[PDB]
Amino acid sequence: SVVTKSIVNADAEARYLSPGELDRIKNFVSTGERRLRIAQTLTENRERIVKQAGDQLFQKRPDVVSPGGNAYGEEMTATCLRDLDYYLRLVTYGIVAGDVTPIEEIGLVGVREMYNSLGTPIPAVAEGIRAMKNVACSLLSAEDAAEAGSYFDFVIGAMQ
């Protein structure tokens, strides 16, 4: 969260929070209701976001669903859709927190290594999350879509 990041930096430099950091958390506090509303609509539409974004991802990357691909067969495809659902959940967490700290702490620290042990391609995971971003942005209002899409953008950038 923004509050914990400000406290962490202040603790590292052994000084009380500067008025700039205090103003930063104050403005974040003010926009908290909008953040919660964005997370609420995302979780309300979580099922269709995952479903149709996954279909777009398969079209974008046919090799994934081709024989020999990581998500070959209905069982493997089901688990990949589960991963997409997990990342949507992390994105809602991050929007509520106001920082990418929860997303990083839960599903971006060692993401490369976990996927290489699994055998799964990280860039293809990024493409799937891009599809989720498109669906979520369509569901959201223009102002709301900019914020939530930015969180999706961080996730895909880390995947790359």
Binding site: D11, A14, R15, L108, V109
Partner: protein
């Protein structure tokens, strides 16, 4: 370049206690300044730069009290445990008023780092001898694996009240007897001596 990759990885192993592939999103270190360049040619600077970094902060400053930060810092950079309460106090001043960057900078800049490890050596597990409590403390620090405990092996060095009171020791006792007895006795080079009580 083969050796340079080995030494870069070794600096990770000593400073962060493990290879950093887990616990980092992306590799957040540009070793190019150290490699075929003079920007961080000083490993005395590459180790310090890693120490300043967020990863060290998240791993060893964020989760522990400053006392444990000091013990871990001397393990990670100087290869030993805090020598005595003097270093505990100095580094606590620095951690109190200037933070992690200054504390790591102080450890690496210290004449101990330079004398033992030097400009061009990744710091290594040192087996100290001369400082008296340092060796047992150092073994206790190094035997622990990472994140084993929340306890501070070297909490602080306790002062001790000596059991044997001096002015009972043989030499002073002779001297105290002499000064007392000679004072009560007659005094050389004085006109009046029978008057004094």
């Amino acid at each position: 370049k083969q050796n340079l990759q080995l030494v870069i990885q070794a600096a990770y192993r000593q400073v962060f206690e493990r290879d950093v592939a887990p616990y980092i999103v992306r590799d957040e270190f540009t070793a190019l300044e150290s490699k075929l360049s003079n920007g961080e040619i000083t490993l005395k600077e590459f180790i310090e730069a890693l120490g300043c970094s967020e990863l060290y902060q998240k791993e060893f400053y964020t989760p522990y009290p400053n006392t444990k930060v000091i013990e871990l810092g001397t393990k990670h950079f100087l290869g030993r445990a805090p020598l005595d309460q003097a270093e505990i106090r100095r580094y606590n001043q620095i951690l109190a008023t200037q933070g992690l960057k200054a504390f790591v900078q102080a450890l690496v800049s210290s004449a101990e780092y330079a004398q033992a490890f030097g400009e061009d050596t990744v710091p290594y597990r040192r087996f100290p001898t001369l400082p008296a409590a340092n060796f047992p403390n150092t073994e206790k620090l190094h035997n622990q694996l990472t994140k084993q405990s929340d306890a501070i092996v070297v909490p602080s060095f306790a002062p001790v009240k000596p059991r044997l009171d001096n002015t009972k020791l043989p030499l002073l006792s002779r001297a105290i007897a002499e000064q007392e007895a000679k004072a009560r006795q007659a005094d050389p080079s004085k006109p009046r001596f029978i008057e004094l009580g």
